[PDB]
Amino acid sequence: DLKSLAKRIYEAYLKNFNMNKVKARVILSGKASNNPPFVIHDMETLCMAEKTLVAKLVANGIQNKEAEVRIFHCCQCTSVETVTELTEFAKAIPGFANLDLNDQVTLLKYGVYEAIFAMLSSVMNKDGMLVAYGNGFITREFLKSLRKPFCDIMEPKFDFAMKFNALELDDSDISLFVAAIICCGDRPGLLNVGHIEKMQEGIVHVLRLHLQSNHPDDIFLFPKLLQKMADLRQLVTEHAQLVQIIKKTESDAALHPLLQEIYRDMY
């Protein structure tokens, strides 16, 4: 029945995203053939990494713009690309493309970041996280050695990711979960509330049934995830606040227009 939906959404997911839990876990431990990630654990190694990742942040006055802002920029890039893959994924969702474009750009405005930190958990571990498509790995310790509030930005994401990864969801769970977070019929400024809601009931149900069969033993996993949706919501709130600070107490770290309008009049 709605099961052809589950596979529907999962196909869109596997297509629209370049990195996925499956690869993330193979990289973050498992050498096999070869290609062990370069570790950015301090300033020296950071510059070493940028030297390759730019010929733009290594020899353009940016080679010496506070490290915190250089990093803030790289993360900014990841958001833009992800917000982009997230848009296609949503359009490939049965019903989304039939809604009023304004309701679309409303669901994407409030769910895009909840989604980001969710999928990002895939590439994180208690010690750090993969960067640059799995080529690098930046330590959790190096990020807390930055000056405030930059050193306070990821720690909460690491705590959430550690509890979130324990649920051991796989890519299929995550596709439905992400669709569930994006098709939230409780967003502000929503015009056609009625429909978005039923859409939600649909995917959530599908997800419930999916986890029920995929993870028969985690029993209360569906409710665990429901809680994590609320958790992601608060994380976003905190993160947005953390950024408003920087944005006005660190004029050197500007935000991309796309991200500028998402944060713009958010919470």
């Binding site: 848009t87 750009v105 227009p257 796309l258 309008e261 713009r264």
Partner: peptide
């Protein structure tokens, strides 16, 4: 608000 970019990205690409 505005969201002039989110629109441009929902069209088709």
């Amino acid at each position: 608000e505005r969201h002039k970019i989110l629109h441009r990205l929902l069209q088709e690409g």
